[PDB]
Amino acid sequence: FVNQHLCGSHLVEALYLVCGERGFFYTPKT
Amino acid sequence: FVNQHLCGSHLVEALYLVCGERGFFYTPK
Amino acid sequence: FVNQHLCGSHLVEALYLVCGERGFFYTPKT
Amino acid sequence: FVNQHLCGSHLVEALYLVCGERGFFYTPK
Amino acid sequence: FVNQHLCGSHLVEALYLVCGERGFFYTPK
Amino acid sequence: FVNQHLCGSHLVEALYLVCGERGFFYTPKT
Amino acid sequence: GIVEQCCTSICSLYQLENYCN
Amino acid sequence: GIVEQCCTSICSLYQLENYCN
Amino acid sequence: GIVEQCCTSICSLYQLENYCN
Amino acid sequence: GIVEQCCTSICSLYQLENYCN
Amino acid sequence: GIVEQCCTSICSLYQLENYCN
Amino acid sequence: GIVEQCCTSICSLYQLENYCN
Ligand SMILES: [Cl-]
Ligand SMILES: [Cl-]
Ligand SMILES: [Cl-]
Ligand SMILES: [Cl-]
Ligand SMILES: [Cl-]
Ligand SMILES: [Cl-]
Ligand SMILES: [Cl-]
Ligand SMILES: [Cl-]
Ligand SMILES: [Zn+2]
Ligand SMILES: [Zn+2]
Ligand SMILES: [Zn+2]
Ligand SMILES: [Zn+2]
Ligand SMILES: [Zn+2]
Ligand SMILES: [Zn+2]
Ligand SMILES: [Zn+2]
Ligand SMILES: [Zn+2]
Ligand SMILES: [Zn+2]
Ligand SMILES: [Zn+2]
Ligand SMILES: [Zn+2]
């Protein structure tokens, strides 16, 4: 898997792929 | 019939823009 | 809605979402 | 039958690349 | 029936993330 | 066509568009 | 859920906002 | 329009260029 | 133009909407 | 190929990895 | 949070998975 | 390679096409 900085929409896309049917949460202010 | 996998990919990008700093949970099922 | 810099393809995607059935124009040299 | 909403999202990204500094109008309807 | 053109666009972005520095060949046909 | 730097996923998307049915190869370590 | 509402029909920005935190 | 031409069939780069300014 | 307003500076949702048809 | 396997069905990360170099 | 871990720093696949439900 | 040509430097359309199969 890539080893790089993931921000914004690219981070969200990576979560979508990694998490599959489980879904995910994107909380940028945490 | 819409492709759920492709739709979801699109939806989370739209939520990124709409939600901004509030963030979101993506719960497909 | 996000409050951030939007450039290139990310700007175009944001317009697509915001503008809906109305469509939009992307004129970068203006 | 193609999903127009998803197709359009894709199309505008392709126009960004193809049109470059010329830009484009996206008029779906 | 899945839209092959839209599916492929999605797939290559997923391969970018999964493959990382190894890269990949995308051979649809 | 754009004349700009294309990296990562944006580079891959550009190849997908440019290459069509031919496909392409993305070898970042070459 | 969001898939049931926003995949079959196009959700406006306002409808998408329901899913935000 | 572009949706009628380029959603049902795949438009080449050359066909997409019609829609540029 | 849009680049000056939204790319090198930041556009509010209302400002992005100025580029809709 | 990848289109036959991963367009009709969703490929997991592990299945996608087959296509890497 | 995810920004500190994965955006200003780098997340391994295992670390990205910490944000799945 | 493609990174040196198109990411740290700029590729023309013709140069991007060198990476097609
Ligand atoms: Cl995915
Ligand atoms: Cl949407
Ligand atoms: Cl970017
Ligand atoms: Cl949208
Ligand atoms: Cl799609
Ligand atoms: Cl296209
Ligand atoms: Cl996938
Ligand atoms: Cl394309
Ligand atoms: Zn980085
Ligand atoms: Zn996927
Ligand atoms: Zn910024
Ligand atoms: Zn980007
Ligand atoms: Zn949308
Ligand atoms: Zn899509
Ligand atoms: Zn640049
Ligand atoms: Zn395309
Ligand atoms: Zn700023
Ligand atoms: Zn770093
Ligand atoms: Zn440069």
Closest alpha carbon to C1 in I19, G17, A25: G17
Q: How many residues does chain K have?
A: 21
* Alpha-carbon span E16 to E7, nearest angstrom: 14
CA distance F24 to F11: 11
> Among partner residues C11, C19, C30, which is closest to I20 by beta-carbon distance?
C19
Q: Are C2 and G20 in contact (CB under 8 A)?
A: no
Residues of E in contact with B6 (CB under 8 A): 3, 6-7, 10
- Distances K13 to C22, K9, L1 between C-alpha atoms, Å: 40, 13, 26
Residue J9 phi/psi, 5° resolution? Answer: -120, 160
The two tokens of residue F1 are 């066509």
Distances (CA, A) of K5 to A4, A30, K18, L9: 11, 11, 11, 30
Q: Could you give the CA distance from residue D2 to residue H11 in angstroms, rounded to a whole number?
A: 14
Contact at 8 Å (CB) between E11 and J6?
yes
* F and L in touch (3+ CB pairs within 8 angstroms): yes
Rounded Cα distance, B18 and C2, in Å: 6
Q: How many residues does chain I have?
A: 21
How many independent structural domains does chain C possess? 1
Nearest to D27 among C16, C23, C30 (CB): C23
Entry resolution (Å): 1.2
Determine the 3-state secondary structure of C12 from DSSP: helix
**What 8-state DSSP symbol labels residue B3?**
-
Provide the shortest C-alpha distance from residue D17 to chain C (in Å). 8
| Method in brief | X-ray
Query: Residue written as tokens 């990562």?
Result: F8
Q: How many residues does chain G have?
A: 21
Q: Closest chain F residue to D15 measured between Cα atoms?
A: F1
**Calpha distance L12→K19 (Å, rounded):** 39
Pairwise CA distance, residues G19 & L9, whole Å: 40
Decide if F1 and H12 are in contact by the 8 Å CB cutoff: no
For residue I1, the one-letter residue type is: G
Residue D27 vs residues A25, C26, F11: alpha-carbon distances, Å: 34, 11, 26
Q: In terms of Cα–Cα distance, which of B9, B8, I18, A2 is closest to G5? A: B8
Test mutation, B10, B11, B12, B17, chain A, max A CBs within 10 A: B12
Range of the domain at C5: 1-30
Query: Residues A9, C5: contact at Cβ < 8 Å?
Result: no
Distance CA(L10)–CA(F11), nearest Å, equals: 11
DSSP strand pairing (B24-26 vs A24-26): antiparallel
Residue whose pair of structure tokens reads 């996923």 in the numeric block: F9
Tokens coding B15: 């939520």
